[PDB]
JSON list of C-alpha atoms in Angstrom, two decimals:
[
{"chain": "A", "resi": 1, "resn": "UNK", "atom": "CA", "xyz": [-36.67, 1.12, -1.63]},
{"chain": "A", "resi": 2, "resn": "UNK", "atom": "CA", "xyz": [-39.85, -0.49, -3.09]},
{"chain": "A", "resi": 3, "resn": "UNK", "atom": "CA", "xyz": [-39.48, -4.03, -4.60]},
{"chain": "A", "resi": 4, "resn": "UNK", "atom": "CA", "xyz": [-41.77, -3.13, -7.59]},
{"chain": "A", "resi": 5, "resn": "UNK", "atom": "CA", "xyz": [-39.55, -0.35, -9.06]},
{"chain": "A", "resi": 6, "resn": "UNK", "atom": "CA", "xyz": [-37.28, -0.46, -12.18]},
{"chain": "A", "resi": 7, "resn": "UNK", "atom": "CA", "xyz": [-33.67, -1.69, -11.67]},
{"chain": "A", "resi": 8, "resn": "UNK", "atom": "CA", "xyz": [-31.97, 1.74, -11.60]},
{"chain": "A", "resi": 9, "resn": "UNK", "atom": "CA", "xyz": [-34.17, 2.64, -8.58]},
{"chain": "A", "resi": 10, "resn": "UNK", "atom": "CA", "xyz": [-33.86, -0.84, -6.93]},
{"chain": "A", "resi": 11, "resn": "UNK", "atom": "CA", "xyz": [-31.22, -1.10, -4.15]},
{"chain": "A", "resi": 12, "resn": "UNK", "atom": "CA", "xyz": [-27.72, -2.28, -4.99]},
{"chain": "A", "resi": 13, "resn": "UNK", "atom": "CA", "xyz": [-25.27, -3.41, -2.33]},
{"chain": "A", "resi": 14, "resn": "UNK", "atom": "CA", "xyz": [-21.81, -1.98, -2.95]},
{"chain": "A", "resi": 15, "resn": "UNK", "atom": "CA", "xyz": [-18.40, -2.78, -1.55]},
{"chain": "A", "resi": 16, "resn": "UNK", "atom": "CA", "xyz": [-15.31, -0.86, -2.61]},
{"chain": "A", "resi": 17, "resn": "UNK", "atom": "CA", "xyz": [-12.18, -2.87, -2.02]},
{"chain": "A", "resi": 18, "resn": "UNK", "atom": "CA", "xyz": [-9.45, -0.26, -1.62]},
{"chain": "A", "resi": 19, "resn": "UNK", "atom": "CA", "xyz": [-5.80, -1.36, -1.62]},
{"chain": "A", "resi": 20, "resn": "UNK", "atom": "CA", "xyz": [-3.10, -0.12, 0.74]},
{"chain": "A", "resi": 21, "resn": "UNK", "atom": "CA", "xyz": [-0.62, -0.76, -2.09]},
{"chain": "A", "resi": 22, "resn": "UNK", "atom": "CA", "xyz": [2.35, 0.46, 0.04]},
{"chain": "A", "resi": 23, "resn": "UNK", "atom": "CA", "xyz": [6.01, -0.60, -0.09]},
{"chain": "A", "resi": 24, "resn": "UNK", "atom": "CA", "xyz": [5.40, -1.86, 3.50]},
{"chain": "A", "resi": 25, "resn": "UNK", "atom": "CA", "xyz": [5.14, -5.53, 4.67]},
{"chain": "A", "resi": 26, "resn": "UNK", "atom": "CA", "xyz": [1.99, -7.12, 3.28]},
{"chain": "A", "resi": 27, "resn": "UNK", "atom": "CA", "xyz": [-0.67, -8.30, 5.78]},
{"chain": "A", "resi": 28, "resn": "UNK", "atom": "CA", "xyz": [-2.95, -9.43, 2.88]},
{"chain": "A", "resi": 29, "resn": "UNK", "atom": "CA", "xyz": [-1.99, -11.90, 0.12]},
{"chain": "A", "resi": 30, "resn": "UNK", "atom": "CA", "xyz": [-3.46, -13.90, -2.78]},
{"chain": "A", "resi": 31, "resn": "UNK", "atom": "CA", "xyz": [-3.93, -17.72, -2.83]},
{"chain": "A", "resi": 32, "resn": "UNK", "atom": "CA", "xyz": [-0.38, -18.23, -4.28]},
{"chain": "A", "resi": 33, "resn": "UNK", "atom": "CA", "xyz": [2.13, -20.35, -2.27]},
{"chain": "A", "resi": 34, "resn": "UNK", "atom": "CA", "xyz": [5.80, -19.65, -1.61]},
{"chain": "A", "resi": 35, "resn": "UNK", "atom": "CA", "xyz": [8.56, -21.85, -2.98]},
{"chain": "A", "resi": 36, "resn": "UNK", "atom": "CA", "xyz": [11.56, -22.41, -0.74]},
{"chain": "A", "resi": 37, "resn": "UNK", "atom": "CA", "xyz": [14.15, -19.55, -0.79]},
{"chain": "A", "resi": 38, "resn": "UNK", "atom": "CA", "xyz": [17.40, -19.93, -2.84]},
{"chain": "A", "resi": 39, "resn": "UNK", "atom": "CA", "xyz": [20.60, -17.80, -2.71]},
{"chain": "A", "resi": 40, "resn": "UNK", "atom": "CA", "xyz": [23.53, -16.72, -4.89]},
{"chain": "A", "resi": 41, "resn": "UNK", "atom": "CA", "xyz": [22.19, -17.94, -8.29]},
{"chain": "A", "resi": 42, "resn": "UNK", "atom": "CA", "xyz": [20.40, -16.20, -11.22]},
{"chain": "A", "resi": 43, "resn": "UNK", "atom": "CA", "xyz": [16.65, -16.78, -10.71]},
{"chain": "A", "resi": 44, "resn": "UNK", "atom": "CA", "xyz": [13.25, -15.41, -11.56]},
{"chain": "A", "resi": 45, "resn": "UNK", "atom": "CA", "xyz": [11.47, -14.24, -8.36]},
{"chain": "A", "resi": 46, "resn": "UNK", "atom": "CA", "xyz": [8.34, -12.79, -6.78]},
{"chain": "A", "resi": 47, "resn": "UNK", "atom": "CA", "xyz": [8.09, -11.16, -3.31]},
{"chain": "A", "resi": 48, "resn": "UNK", "atom": "CA", "xyz": [4.51, -10.17, -2.29]},
{"chain": "A", "resi": 49, "resn": "UNK", "atom": "CA", "xyz": [3.70, -9.37, -6.00]},
{"chain": "B", "resi": 1, "resn": "UNK", "atom": "CA", "xyz": [6.04, 32.61, 24.33]},
{"chain": "B", "resi": 2, "resn": "UNK", "atom": "CA", "xyz": [8.25, 32.04, 21.21]},
{"chain": "B", "resi": 3, "resn": "UNK", "atom": "CA", "xyz": [11.44, 30.35, 19.86]},
{"chain": "B", "resi": 4, "resn": "UNK", "atom": "CA", "xyz": [13.04, 29.46, 16.45]},
{"chain": "B", "resi": 5, "resn": "UNK", "atom": "CA", "xyz": [12.72, 26.00, 14.78]},
{"chain": "B", "resi": 6, "resn": "UNK", "atom": "CA", "xyz": [16.33, 26.03, 13.48]},
{"chain": "B", "resi": 7, "resn": "UNK", "atom": "CA", "xyz": [16.86, 22.79, 11.44]},
{"chain": "B", "resi": 8, "resn": "UNK", "atom": "CA", "xyz": [14.16, 20.52, 13.07]},
{"chain": "B", "resi": 9, "resn": "UNK", "atom": "CA", "xyz": [10.87, 19.11, 11.67]},
{"chain": "B", "resi": 10, "resn": "UNK", "atom": "CA", "xyz": [12.01, 16.89, 8.75]},
{"chain": "B", "resi": 11, "resn": "UNK", "atom": "CA", "xyz": [10.64, 13.31, 8.57]},
{"chain": "B", "resi": 12, "resn": "UNK", "atom": "CA", "xyz": [11.18, 10.15, 6.46]},
{"chain": "B", "resi": 13, "resn": "UNK", "atom": "CA", "xyz": [8.70, 10.78, 3.59]},
{"chain": "B", "resi": 14, "resn": "UNK", "atom": "CA", "xyz": [8.32, 7.09, 2.55]},
{"chain": "B", "resi": 15, "resn": "UNK", "atom": "CA", "xyz": [9.07, 3.47, 3.65]},
{"chain": "B", "resi": 16, "resn": "UNK", "atom": "CA", "xyz": [11.70, 2.84, 0.91]},
{"chain": "B", "resi": 17, "resn": "UNK", "atom": "CA", "xyz": [15.30, 2.09, 1.93]},
{"chain": "B", "resi": 18, "resn": "UNK", "atom": "CA", "xyz": [17.73, 4.53, 0.23]},
{"chain": "B", "resi": 19, "resn": "UNK", "atom": "CA", "xyz": [21.42, 5.18, 0.89]},
{"chain": "B", "resi": 20, "resn": "UNK", "atom": "CA", "xyz": [24.21, 7.50, -0.28]},
{"chain": "B", "resi": 21, "resn": "UNK", "atom": "CA", "xyz": [21.77, 9.71, -2.27]},
{"chain": "B", "resi": 22, "resn": "UNK", "atom": "CA", "xyz": [20.68, 13.37, -2.36]},
{"chain": "B", "resi": 23, "resn": "UNK", "atom": "CA", "xyz": [16.96, 12.71, -2.87]},
{"chain": "B", "resi": 24, "resn": "UNK", "atom": "CA", "xyz": [14.41, 15.43, -3.79]}
]
């Protein structure tokens, strides 16, 4: 890689984030916080997305 | 040497809980 060359020849750093999107307990999460849990009432919910 | 597998060598295909079902 030479610093003079046109952009398509210039180096790009690449990362591929690849998701283990399994129905198995999540080790990784977003910034979102939990509420407290509630039972035996009609509610909207989210578990791990 | 040799033997027959009979009915062995199945495994849980996925981490889903299922019950009382004839899954395919």
